[PDB]
Design a protein around this ligand. Sequence first.
Ligand SMILES: NC(=O)C1=CN([C@@H]2O[C@H](COP(=O)(O)OP(=O)(O)OC[C@H]3O[C@@H](n4cnc5c(N)ncnc54)[C@H](O)[C@@H]3O)[C@@H](O)[C@H]2O)C=CC1
Lengths: 357, 372
Amino acid sequence: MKIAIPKERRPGEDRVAISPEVVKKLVGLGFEVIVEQGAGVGASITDDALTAAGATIASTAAQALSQADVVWKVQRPMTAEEGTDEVALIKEGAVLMCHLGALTNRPVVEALTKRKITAYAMELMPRISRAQSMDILSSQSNLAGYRAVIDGAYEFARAFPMMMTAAGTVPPARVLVFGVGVAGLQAIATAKRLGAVVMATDVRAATKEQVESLGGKFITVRKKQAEAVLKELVKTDIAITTALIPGKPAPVLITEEMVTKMKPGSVIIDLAVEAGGNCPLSEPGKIVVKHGVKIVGHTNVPSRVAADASPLFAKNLLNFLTPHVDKDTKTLVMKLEDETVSGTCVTRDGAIVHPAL
Amino acid sequence: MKIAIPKERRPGEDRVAISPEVVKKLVGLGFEVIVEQGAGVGASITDDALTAAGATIASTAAQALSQADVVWKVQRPMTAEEGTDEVALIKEGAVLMCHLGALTNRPVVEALTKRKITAYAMELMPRISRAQSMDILSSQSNLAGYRAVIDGAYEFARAFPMMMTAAGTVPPARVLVFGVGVAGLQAIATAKRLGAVVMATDVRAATKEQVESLGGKFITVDDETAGGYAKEMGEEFRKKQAEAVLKELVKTDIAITTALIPGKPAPVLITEEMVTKMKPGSVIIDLAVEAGGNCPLSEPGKIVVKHGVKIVGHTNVPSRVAADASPLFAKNLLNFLTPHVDKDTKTLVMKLEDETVSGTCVTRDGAIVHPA
Ligand SMILES: NC(=O)C1=CN([C@@H]2O[C@H](COP(=O)(O)OP(=O)(O)OC[C@H]3O[C@@H](n4cnc5c(N)ncnc54)[C@H](O)[C@@H]3O)[C@@H](O)[C@H]2O)C=CC1
């Protein structure tokens, strides 16, 4: 059975749904792994690294997908509606696993249905302990949190750590995190090891135990809490906002007003800029300089860590798929009763199985 | 007594030779401090912050250095030939303190002489324990080593620390620091903060203890350097070092080169041949790029990609951390000047017997002192 991985065509996407380690396991299961040439370059994965692991390199995506029984991608395929029709390249009746937007994209689903393609929307993965190893949202958000801090320190004109030197001492950077989700947690851990003083906040107080767990200071003041956040913000150096609730615009945690009171040289990294942004001043894909403050709004953050994001994404897919491989008959048999299968399947045999729109 | 600090005008310089804390110290010493308007913007220091510290703001740099008895700058003033004649703005007989690049910028030196200005090239500061607090090279390089790691992490498409997630374990980054001077030391400490596995190498055996004390491993090449600083090393060594460094360079993800040799061009530590055997996606941060570079592929002010490796050669790295580099620079100047402000009588008399004075002063009252 053939499994193909094409190069991500959507501008800005540099991750790839494969890694040499996974290629070895796929071949081990009985698959022939085909990868579009140049697919992993963005992720520091050369065509030679992949062929050394057991993969065959195909030129162009049409070639790679022409006879693939299984297709893995990072972002959902493009439709003729967006130009290049990637769905028409997938064999009819083939299996697709990738972040399908699922919730918000109708045309891709309609397109998949017309070709009788069974598509599993990895991002819809049931939130059960046993499926944590197949959860892409988590793996990518973890790296996204780490990178928020890195980009924060790169844009900051001060050093994160407190440095006591012959020439005086460098005070530590003060980092404030809005959103103690998976990403928020890594932003806290990363800002901590760099030596910053880390404050965290979230409307969900159940996180209070974890913020303190990593060394952060939960901000406790319930709306008189807003004054408790303006209090910390006014003396904050790096504000990292990760309030992204998949399937809904992002909350406005920092108004242009809260920003005009911040200090020059301060930095705001809005990880939720795609969904509007926790800060209305952030502009998708740019760094705005307002009131002396830099508002960072990079688009594909996990792609900024593509070389680590890719191997993890590839293992989430392998974890989700391995339980269903026969190998002895070299065929895929997705157990319909499996909760990870029925929950992520958005279209099968020409029928839309999931209601979202 | 008036001390003035103008805005740095050279390309890309965001630092400023002042800070509110230091404006406070100066005023207490009996000084009238004047800072040119917007001189600390690139350093995140507002005119308001300097005013609250007790400083006066002058609309123009000309106005600020007009009556100034002492002038503090980050980089050497520009000559009439360079467009803006800053030397001309300096009051004749005044004292100037800054990184003069004297040894390689004679025109600015003799230009200062023609105005009988007394200049102390802070970069020449004697290499001695009691000077550590007045040494700009150290304060600036220490921040540059930290920055090299931030710029390194920024260009790297992988995470520095080992990540243990539900999707699996991702090993930590492997860092190799070439030249464990002030910059290399902070690079190691900062690389270790982010959780990387750190390797390091230097020609000075004294550095082996410092590297291991930070959790890093030293790469010994031979064993069998100078009066503080390093010398131009031999080829038997130079070729044996490369051979021993390559054993590790092939696993290295981030290589930070900080090797410098007083006078001579920076030593080449990573050849193109060596870069060709590194892992795709690796990053080389060349901090000696301005002195020639430790990697022949580095290009000043650019990020080059050769053989799948990113060669980063940013200029004026201290300015990349300008908001912390400036208050330290200002403190180096303050610590250098303080011992000379007479108290029994109150004026500025630089005692010439002072090693930090005889060594930094390159010109005094129309006469040049030690250009050879
Ligand atoms: N006030 C004081 O006492 C000062 C003391 N120092 C001391 O000086 C030493 C280093 O001085 P830095 O300012 O960092 O000067 P630097 O920038 O010249 O140091 C470069 C580093 O690269 C090394 N290096 C040179 N050529 C090399 C080659 N071919 N291969 C491998 N490594 C090479 C040197 O040994 C040195 O550690 C430390 O011991 C430091 O504490 C430095 C400044 C002031």
